[PDB]
Design a protein around this ligand. Sequence first.
Ligand code: U1X
Length: 182
Amino acid sequence: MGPGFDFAQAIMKKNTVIARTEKGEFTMLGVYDRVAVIPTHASVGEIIYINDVETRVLDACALRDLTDTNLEITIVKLDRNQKFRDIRHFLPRCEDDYNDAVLSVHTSKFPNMYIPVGQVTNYGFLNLGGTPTHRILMYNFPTRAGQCGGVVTTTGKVIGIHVGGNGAQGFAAMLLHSYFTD
Ligand SMILES: O=C(Nc1ccccc1)N1CCCC1
């Protein structure tokens, strides 16, 4: 409906796939080459389904900060025959607060779904499902089961992936440029 949704749609159409693990279906953001991200609670194994195709996982890393605290981001390299468009120049370099963000989801359950979530706080520490987690962004939207992996964007920036909620607020793990230096 506006430039926020326009940027969000451009990322969804070219840089997302539907990832299925034994823990469910997730929006998965492709970042560059065959490298993608997914919330760590997806429990990626040796084989993942990508758009319902059986796919070998060439490598997977659950990120933690230098305090050895969970960040809830898993970086996955996929044995896929096609590269993602490189979107690393849209990733923020530093932890920050944001105005006017969109959370975008694409699964069997929620196809072509775009939620304007408004202001995004750099929340920092969150006990997420019992697990101490750092670099959490928070938005005041009642997000629901099925939105995990959803992409958070502002005009011009891809800032996080949805990892939880408490019924009133939603929480995303930051994406930072430094995660994807090759
Ligand atoms: O599931 C939803 N809405 C919704 C709300 C918040 C997050 C995700 C989805 N709907 C079912 C029919 C009316 C709308």
